[PDB]
């Protein structure tokens, strides 16, 4: 049940993909730590919530 993932390495020693290991010890998922491997999204629903979305090179009002 060990999950092995890659670390995003910042400073490098003068010594490659370094991995880390996680095992969940509890049945309830609320006990789990955060994996912090989080995806993102498009801001459009806030920055461009327009019915006809127009291209930035074209006039906004036609």
């Amino acid at each position: 049940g060990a999950q092995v993932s890659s670390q995003k390495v910042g400073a490098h020693e003068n010594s490659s993909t370094i991995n880390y290991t996680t095992i969940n010890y509890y049945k309830d998922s609320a006990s789990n730590a955060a994996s912090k491997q989080d995806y993102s999204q498009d801001p459009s629903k806030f920055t461009e919530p327009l019915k006809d979305v127009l291209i930035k090179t074209a006039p906004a009002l036609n």
Binding site: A2, Q3, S5, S6, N19
Partner: peptide, 4 residues
């Protein structure tokens, strides 16, 4: 185990 499961590497990702």
């Amino acid at each position: 185990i499961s590497e990702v």
